[PDB]
């Protein structure tokens, strides 16, 4: 729960290059699979569990 977006996922810390104005990333199905950390400037992907 970063900015009110609740769900279930696993963080992987990928190498996605996000822009300063971009924080959320969605797939073809508009499901948010990557978010930006509020405190740190790292990029964390949201991958579903098993």
């Amino acid at each position: 729960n970063f900015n009110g977006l609740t769900g279930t996922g696993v963080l992987t810390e990928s190498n996605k290059k996000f822009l300063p104005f971009q924080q959320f990333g969605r797939d073809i199905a508009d499901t948010t699979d990557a978010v930006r950390d509020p405190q740190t400037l790292e990029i964390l992907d949201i991958t579903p569990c098993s």
């Binding site: 996605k16 290059k17 996000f18 822009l19 104005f21 971009q22």
Partner: protein, 185 residues
């Protein structure tokens, strides 16, 4: 859009009638900060910025300002360095004035080169102005001071394009950048 490298264009104005009867948006970009104010500016027939050359600039684009209900100073705005093409997209919808910017080096002749260059968002603030007319502000730099009178010494190179509601199909690269676009109309 413009490809100058002498800091000529450093601001714009927005308004309906460009006088004290209606509101007007005054955006001026200095060498170290940016001033954006919404006030009843009395724009003259030829608004321009004066310089006493290096510093001590005089705002001779307006004659009076009373209401002055909205001010904004970002001082990161639009210079993008001095070493070429700086594209800007201004949008006013639902009272919010959106501004876009992008810096693309020029390595061709005096013409718009091919390719794609997506613009990045810059700022989005509400002004609530029925913007219908605009004019580009430019620094004269006549090596001396000049009064507020119009038709100054212009003796001592920008593109203007109008936007329309169009449908586009954006293609994002593997790194997340826009490399192609298709105008369906």
């Amino acid at each position: 859009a413009s490809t100058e490298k002498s800091n000529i264009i450093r601001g714009w104005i927005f308004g309906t009638t460009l006088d004290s009867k209606t509101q007007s948006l005054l955006i001026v970009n200095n060498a170290t900060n940016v001033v954006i104010k919404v006030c009843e500016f009395q724009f003259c027939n030829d608004p321009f910025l004066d310089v006493y050359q290096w510093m001590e600039s005089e705002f001779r684009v307006y004659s009076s300002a009373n209401n002055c209900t909205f001010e904004y100073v970002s001082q990161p705005e639009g210079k993008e360095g001095n070493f070429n093409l700086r594209e800007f997209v201004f949008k006013n919808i639902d009272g919010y004035f959106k501004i876009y910017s992008k810096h693309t080096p020029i390595n061709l002749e005096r013409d718009l080169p091919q390719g794609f260059s997506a613009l990045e968002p810059l700022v989005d603030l509400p002004i609530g102005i029925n913007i219908t007319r605009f004019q580009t502000l430019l620094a004269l730099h006549r090596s001396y001071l000049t009064p507020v009178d119009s038709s100054s010494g212009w003796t001592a190179a920008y593109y203007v394009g109008y936007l329309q509601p169009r449908t586009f199909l954006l293609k994002y690269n593997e790194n997340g950048t826009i490399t192609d676009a298709v105008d369906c109309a």
